[PDB]
């Protein structure tokens, strides 16, 4: 289990005619693991503040707002909110 | 059968992300929306880095991203540098 096939699908969406080396794809996969863990650990700390046994979209969203720099955070929240709204309406 | 990724408009794997969230015991349980939200955020960040790294590849007269393109794209971006740290090659 890695994110690499999914990274590759996103690469071809944003740059249809640009490829990627093995080591570059390793670096990309490591970024996704690193941010996954940062956001999961912050979500864990928030859930404890709230005495909450479940991590929900509310904790992920707050984790994104605290961990990501401001402009990336604003756009990431827009994307996460959009995906959950599309999922709920499917 | 229709994937949670497909329902959410995503490429990133919602099911796999849900499994990683549950496996790590960040809390007792994980809600249905949390993995969708997190998958969307990780997909957005991948797209942002790939956009900038691929622009660096092309500016560098290449047709594929190598580690130095990622290093340059990230080092030239205040926010990605803050989030991801220095890329070491």
């Amino acid at each position: 289990e890695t994110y690499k096939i999914y990274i590759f699908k996103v690469l071809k969406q944003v740059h249809p005619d640009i490829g990627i080396s093995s080591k570059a794809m390793g670096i990309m996969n490591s970024f996704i693991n690193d941010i996954f863990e940062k956001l999961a650990q912050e979500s864990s700390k928030l859930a404890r503040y709230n005495k909450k046994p479940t991590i929900t979209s509310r904790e992920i969203q707050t984790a994104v707002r605290l961990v990501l720099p401001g402009e990336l955070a604003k756009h990431a929240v827009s994307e996460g909110t959009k995906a959950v709204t599309k999922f709920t309406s499917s | 059968a229709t994937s949670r990724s497909s329902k959410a408009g995503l490429q990133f794997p919602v099911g796999r992300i849900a499994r990683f969230l549950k496996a790590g015991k960040y809390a007792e349980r994980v809600g249905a929306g949390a993995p969708v939200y997190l998958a969307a955020v990780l997909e957005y960040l991948a797209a942002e880095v790939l956009e900038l790294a691929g622009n660096a590849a092309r500016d560098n007269k290449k047709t594929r991203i190598v580690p130095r393109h990622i290093q340059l794209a990230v080092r030239n971006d205040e926010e990605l540098s803050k989030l991801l740290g220095d890329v070491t090659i």
């Binding site: 590759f8 990627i20 080396s21 093995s22 080591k23 794809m25 390793g26 | 594929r64």
Partner: peptide, 7 residues
Amino acid sequence: DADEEDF
């Protein structure tokens, strides 16, 4: 080596 090949 492996690194330098295409993904």
